[PDB]
């Protein structure tokens, strides 16, 4: 874990941090999911000029066998490996992860 793990914040609170107009696109945080409890969520901010500033939530799921994934094709031993990969490149996501969300 580390700076980008926000724990048990709500989706409305994650969206209020991430939607701060200063945040570049790809600003992100990992948090617990409120609905599939047992899963996490990579919340990342995106921009397109039809909808403007908006957030995408990707459920991250944990294996019994330890690992974490957004796609069951692409699995990681930890949340830190996961975040690392998606910061090198987008591989299916809206945008590559760039900043850790502030505050």
Swiss-Prot record:
The role this protein plays is: This phosphoprotein, required for both the initiation and the maintenance of neoplastic transformation, is a protein kinase that catalyzes the phosphorylation of tyrosine residues in vitro. Causes mitotic slippage in addition to cytokinesis failure in the host cell. Phosphorylates and attenuates the activity of host CDK1, possibly causing the mitotic slippage.
Give the superkingdom in one word: Viruses
UniProt protein name: Tyrosine-protein kinase transforming protein Src
Quote the subunit structure annotation.
Answer: Homodimer.
- Family of this protein: Belongs to the protein kinase superfamily. Tyr protein kinase family. SRC subfamily.
For this chain, the Swiss-Prot or TrEMBL PTM comment says: The phosphorylated form is termed pp60v-src.
Ranges for domain SH2 come to 4-101
